[PDB]
Amino acid sequence: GPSSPHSLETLYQSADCSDANDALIVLIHLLMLESGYIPQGTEAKALSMPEKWKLSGVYKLQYMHPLCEGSSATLTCVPLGNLIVVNATLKINNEIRSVKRLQLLPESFICKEKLGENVANIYKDLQKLSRLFKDQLVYPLLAFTRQALNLPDVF
Known part of the structure; x- marks a missing residue:
């Protein structure tokens, strides 16, 4: 078989999910980690969810990336109806830019x-x-x- 991630298991345990929405965010967070993003708010990214990842009915996850120095990325996830709307946001030089909204x-x-x-x-x-x-x-x-950082394409 394919070996499952060690990280999802521990991250899910750390998350203490109350519903399906929480479970989806955990997986989303994991996928960000597997692509190289480094989260703020945790000392061991593979073991524990960031502090305050879940608050006031919304979710917030903040990252930096080793190939994207000089910027930080934020996912703001908002339940709307039966969906979760994932907003991706980039911060460069105290300027905030919207990148993507995903349903x-x-x-x-x-x-x-x-x-x-x-x-x-x-x-x-x-x-x-x-x-x-x-x-x-x-x-x-x-x-x-x-692009924003004036660097060549990663792929």
Whole structure:
């Protein structure tokens, strides 16, 4: 089989998810880590969710990237209806720029009726979410960031 991530397991445990929305954000965060992003608000990125990743009904995750020095990226995730809207934002030289808004449906990727079971049971269609999230957010964010910093394309 493919070996699962050690990190999702521990990150999910650290997250103390209360619903399907929390579970989706954990996976989103993991995908950012696997693409090289370094999160603020945690001492061991692979072991614990950032401090205040979940607050006031919204989610906030902040990162820097080793290939994007001179900037920071923020994901602001907001539940709207049955969807979660992921807003990607870039900060360079105290200027704030909007990069992407992505609509995600948790039910497509989370089995909410298996929330009280294992990580292997909670998430379904993992490669599908990874390809979607990377294709539609992570990679355009990196490209946008590289452009703004006047650097060559990473891919």
